[PDB]
Write a protein that holds these residues in place. Structure first.
Motif, PDB file in Angstrom:
ATOM      1  N   UNK A  99     -14.427 -38.814  -8.605  1.00  0.00           N
ATOM      2  CA  UNK A  99     -15.752 -38.548  -9.209  1.00  0.00           C
ATOM      3  C   UNK A  99     -16.822 -39.193  -8.391  1.00  0.00           C
ATOM      4  N   UNK A 100     -17.973 -38.494  -8.229  1.00  0.00           N
ATOM      5  CA  UNK A 100     -19.060 -38.950  -7.386  1.00  0.00           C
ATOM      6  C   UNK A 100     -19.637 -40.201  -7.958  1.00  0.00           C
ATOM      7  N   UNK A 122     -20.323 -42.462  -3.126  1.00  0.00           N
ATOM      8  CA  UNK A 122     -20.966 -41.258  -3.586  1.00  0.00           C
ATOM      9  C   UNK A 122     -21.915 -41.652  -4.689  1.00  0.00           C
ATOM     10  N   UNK A 123     -21.572 -42.691  -5.488  1.00  0.00           N
ATOM     11  CA  UNK A 123     -22.254 -43.098  -6.701  1.00  0.00           C
ATOM     12  C   UNK A 123     -23.723 -43.347  -6.562  1.00  0.00           C
TER      13      UNK A 123
END
Length: 12
Positions: free
Chosen positions: A1-2, A8-9
């Motif tokens: 998950x980003x 990515x977060x």
């Protein structure tokens, strides 16, 4: 998950 993964977060 980003939003989960720190590399990515920041984009989330």
């Amino acid at each position: 998950g980003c939003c989960s993964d720190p590399r990515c977060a920041w984009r989330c």
